[PDB]
Amino acid sequence: PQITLWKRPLVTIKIGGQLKEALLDTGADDTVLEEMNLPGRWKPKMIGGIGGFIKVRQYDQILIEICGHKAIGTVLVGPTPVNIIGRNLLTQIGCTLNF
Amino acid sequence: PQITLWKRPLVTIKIGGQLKEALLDTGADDTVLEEMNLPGRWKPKMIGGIGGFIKVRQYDQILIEICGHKAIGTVLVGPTPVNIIGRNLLTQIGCTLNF
Numbered sequence: 730p731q732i733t734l735w736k737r738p739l740v741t742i743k744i745g746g747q748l749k750e751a752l753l754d755t756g757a758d759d760t761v762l763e764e765m766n767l768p769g770r771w772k773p774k775m776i777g778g779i780g781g782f783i784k785v786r787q788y789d790q791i792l793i794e795i796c797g798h799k800a801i802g803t804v805l806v807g808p809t810p811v812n813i814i815g816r817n818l819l820t821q822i823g824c825t826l827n828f
Numbered sequence: 829p830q831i832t833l834w835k836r837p838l839v840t841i842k843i844g845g846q847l848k849e850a851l852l853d854t855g856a857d858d859t860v861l862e863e864m865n866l867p868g869r870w871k872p873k874m875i876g877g878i879g880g881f882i883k884v885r886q887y888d889q890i891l892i893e894i895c896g897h898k899a900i901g902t903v904l905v906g907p908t909p910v911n912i913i914g915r916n917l918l919t920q921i922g923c924t925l926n927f
């Protein structure tokens with residue numbers, strides 16, 4: 730689809746068999762989701778945003794479906810203010826900016 | 829143009845007579861620029877993201893040229909690590925997400 734930006738670009742995602750709402754965030758290198766239980770191993774990492782750095786759990790090679798488009802990649806889980814889909818997954822679904 | 833997301837979507841902008849590099853950021857409600865001494869009146873504001881909040885100065889009706897596309901709206905200035913073009917201006921240059 731072509732998504733205009735007068736509203737937040739929010740979409741439904743499916744991860745770990747659960748549906749959630751997430752923000753398509755071209756300003757994020759990485760995908761960061763709010764606290765949740767994910768299966769598999771994870772390593773502690775740190776990521777920085779506009780307000781500083783936070784501790785996150787890094788899950789590698791996680792299956793995640795975005796508007797019916799499948800992606801498999803790194804998902805960070807931690808105290809982000811909102812679920813964000815970053816470029817590591819936006820590229821996998823073929824997302825581009827156009828103007 | 830069409831901008832892929834393999835790398836950060838940085839573009840050249842013109843504001844207050846200065847050329848800068850800024851992120852085309854669908855996840856940013858508003859436009860946030862690195863510290864700079866703009867003239868005119870402002871009002872204080874706080875914006876939050878990963879890591880918490882930062883204090884910024886809100887200037888209204890600021891002209892920004894984004895890849896030759898003119899836009900005028902609210903611009904926040906503060907200790908951001910990156911220049912961020914948000915949805916308030918992205919809509920004005922006809923920017924959409926597409927996948």
Ligand SMILES: CCC(CC)CN(C[C@@H](O)[C@H](Cc1ccccc1)NC(=O)O[C@H]1CO[C@H]2OCC[C@H]21)S(=O)(=O)c1ccc(OC)cc1
Pocket residue numbers: 754755756757758759760761776777778779780809810811813815853855856857858859860875876877878909910912914
């Ligand atoms: C609340 C949604 C989201 C933060 C979750 C909003 N951000 C825009 C993002 O695109 C920032 C924009 C951003 C980019 C780079 C440095 C600081 C901020 N990117 C970001 O935080 O990404 C992180 C996750 O991937 C990593 O790659 C970038 C940093 C990591 S923001 O910078 O904090 C922000 C921008 C405008 C605004 O106006 C109301 C309010 C908040």
